[PDB]
Design a protein around this ligand. Structure first.
Ligand SMILES: NC(=O)CC[C@H](N)C(=O)O
Ligand SMILES: NC(=O)CC[C@H](N)C(=O)O
Ligand SMILES: [Mg+2]
Ligand SMILES: [Mg+2]
Ligand SMILES: [Mg+2]
Ligand SMILES: [Mg+2]
Lengths: 10, 443, 443, 10, 10
């Protein structure tokens, strides 16, 4: 996790 | 001053206004007003209009109480949407007791009291620059919000483009036409999420502009067949909406946070302010995050803060210090969400900052190590503590803090606590569809 | 005076009016009229138009009776809705016997008689400031009212906003263009509930304005595709609708209720008035609350009065004294609902107040400790008594009160009692759907 | 009870 | 009876 909003495009 | 009385009468005379809204803000932050015909403008400007002051308390009001409606001349604004036979103008008004004493239950008067306390410490101005974020949802045939976003945009993307739509552009231009000072705008990280930044101004003016901005954004989005919401976290798994507050303290007309000869180009006053905000951060979270949904945003992985720390460059810090210095030196508090009452949030933030300044508290070391990597127990031994996880926990923390209680007075304290306790009790006893999806068939 | 005969003739001459309504008020409060062409204006102004005076009695009329239709020149109003070939104007007229004696069965003449009795006591004016509130219901395709409210607004909320709709704003502006003196307006507590307050005026003028206000509100709501109702309690579990009456008594052109050197800044005349209202409160409830539905509003928990007491700040007091003093010193009676006949309600209130003044009755101690806390027996030992719970109980209380009987005279008393007894008998023998939902399957 | 219209929103 | 047209509203 720790990065979900940015990588939500995938 | 910007407007005098004679200017007000002259302006309404040519503009042919017939309806005047004497708007004010209650405890929950929703905009209220009492409306008068233009023939009552003379009585309004004489501070003689009476109304039920218990409406400020919201749904926890008990008894009717008569208070006056002292309007502010500088807040005079003519609404661009003509109301058939005549135009509509608004005044933002203060609440006064029948004996002429300002009402202690008015959030705007409370903010003015906190600003007076700040002036008693030698400072002159307290500037605020807000960064309100909002979502745009499409309406259905029946004209009610749906769960579909207006665009599949990204961070700083040129997603809406030209060829119509671009509700953000229309909102920015319309706000410019109404006298707002818009700094910049961009598409936010989440799809259908937008941000518009204002120029920094005085605390009272900034809060008034925030309220007017919410009203205008909702109206314009309704015009475009869209729903605009300032809900902190309307959707799960998607970035939430924040209202990052850029705070700058001025002394004798110069920035008091700037010191060119100190490390990070920061003055001792700035360090005391940061220490004061850090000390009370877990306590005023109930005010800056007053809804149940506000704490679904305060979860890791979506750039929202979750721990009490300050930094110059970090992933989701509670307090961030922008690189710009000099006149534009400021401290940014990123835990505030747009659902918060601007006056109450500014009051508690200023009270915490002044408490840090008055007692000369020592700020902790800045965090630049990605505390998300280390465990909660692996960081508890440091000065890093977690923000309250639920509204009830934040209410418990807020009640215990003595300084934050005086930050808004006994009347606001009791009524806010009662309303928020009722709100939490309503939420905790509900049976949500998630529970049925998880347990109805399994058990 | 505001109009003379020559002014009326000239006004109709240029405005080209063809239809004149000689309107009046019956026992039940519904507006009645007889209509004449403009060619009969000379006969009308000569107090020569005859009509069936039994129409005042309502549905209990038994015999035709000829009566005269003396119009009041100051009530001349030109309706803004043109009737194609020519405009429509109205007069509010008094009812006179064929021998020139005023008709004892006319509520307006009864109010004038009570005002003459008041002048015999040395007082000059009796001012009334009403606070009528109403609900707005959406119409269906067939143009009949439904149970859906026009908005989900709140107390003093900015719910209707801009962008069309806002029927309250249109009503206020239109009333302003008709010569009404609107003080202020706001959204009421219940969804779809609104309130418009007039400036205080004379009793007869205030009652005429109340009737005209009801007519105009109904018409304008019908224009906007809405249904406006002054029903005391259209919905269960939702705030009701009142017609709080602010009463002020004047002597020699000055307020007789004000005394700067007395406690609460209240004169002895004001205390006698309060005592008179308290003594007869259970007796005139049948007049101020004349419908069966009126007593579904008089239930605890919705700020409507339920007990006979007076206070300056309390949760739902029968009599409330606003904080404003001096010329604006007044006593507010909150039991009245908009369904009441304004003339009859004002007559009984004034008669009770004069009875208190004439006998110098001693007002009871004000209550400021939330009578709702204790039980009925726990408060019966004090002076706090209960208002009648049904229309039949109020009718029984009203019949036994000798003073209240002469407040409206023998003719009005007998016809009102007969009509209300028939109304109650029709209601008590009905089988409501609630009974079938409760007992059809259980038993 | 004692307060139903005000808390009717909930 | 004796009153039906007037009382027909009920
Ligand atoms: N990139 C950003 O600054 C977005 C901030 C994030 N949406 C929040 O709720 O704090
Ligand atoms: N809060 C108010 O003033 C509303 C009064 C309430 N609707 C009543 O029926 O009396
Ligand atoms: Mg942002
Ligand atoms: Mg930011
Ligand atoms: Mg009201
Ligand atoms: Mg009232």
């Amino acid at each position: 996790t720790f990065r979900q909003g940015d990588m939500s495009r995938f | 001053a910007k407007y005098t009385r004679e200017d007000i009468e002259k302006l309404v005379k040519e503009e042919n206004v017939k309806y005047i809204r004497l708007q004010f803000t209650d405890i929950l932050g929703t905009i209220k007003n009492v409306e008068i015909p233009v023939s009552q403008l003379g009585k309004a400007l004489d501070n003689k209009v009476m109304f039920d002051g218990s409406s400020i308390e919201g749904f926890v009001r008990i008894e009717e109480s008569d208070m006056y409606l002292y309007p502010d001349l500088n807040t005079f604004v003519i609404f661009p949407w003509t109301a058939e036979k005549g135009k509509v103008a608004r005044f933002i008004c203060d609440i006064y007791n029948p004996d002429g004493t300002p009402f202690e239950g008015d959030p705007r008067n409370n903010l003015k009291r906190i600003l007076k306390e700040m002036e008693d410490l030698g400072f002159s101005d307290f500037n605020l620059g807000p960064e309100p974020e909002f979502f745009l949802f499409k309406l259905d045939e029946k004209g009610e919000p749906t769960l579909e976003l207006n665009d599949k945009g990204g961070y700083f993307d040129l997603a809406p483009t030209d060829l119509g739509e671009n509700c953000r552009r229309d909102i920015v231009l319309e706000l410019e036409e109404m006298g707002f000072e818009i700094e910049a705008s961009h598409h936010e990280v989440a799809p259908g999420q937008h941000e518009i930044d204002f120029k920094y101004a005085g605390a009272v003016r900034s809060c008034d502009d925030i309220q007017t901005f919410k009203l205008v954004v909702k109206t314009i989005a309704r015009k475009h067949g869209l729903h605009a919401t300032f809900m902190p976290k309307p959707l799960f798994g998607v970035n939430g909406s924040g209202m990052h507050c850029n705070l700058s303290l001025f002394k004798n007309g110069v920035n008091a946070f700037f010191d060119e000869n100190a490390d990070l180009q920061l003055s001792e006053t700035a360090k005391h302010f940061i220490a004061g905000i850090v000390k009370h951060a877990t306590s005023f979270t109930a005010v800056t995050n007053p809804t149940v949904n506000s704490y679904k945003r305060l979860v890791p992985g979506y750039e929202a803060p979750c721990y009490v720390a300050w930094s110059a460059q970090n992933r989701s810090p509670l307090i961030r210090i922008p690189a710009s210095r000099g006149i534009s030196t400021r401290v940014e508090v990123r835990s505030v969400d747009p659902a918060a009452n601007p006056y109450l949030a500014l009051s508690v933030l200023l009270a915490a900052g002044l408490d840090g300044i008055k007692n000369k508290l020592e700020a902790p070391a800045p965090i630049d190590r990605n505390i998300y990597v280390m465990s909660k127990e692996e960081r508890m031994e440091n000065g890093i503590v977690d923000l309250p996880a639920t509204l009830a926990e934040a209410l418990e923390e807020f009640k215990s803090n003595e300084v934050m209680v005086k930050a808004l007075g006994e009347h606001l304290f009791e009524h806010f606590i009662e309303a928020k306790e009722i709100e939490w009790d309503m939420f905790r006893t509900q049976v949500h569809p998630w529970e049925r999806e998880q347990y109805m068939s399994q058990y």
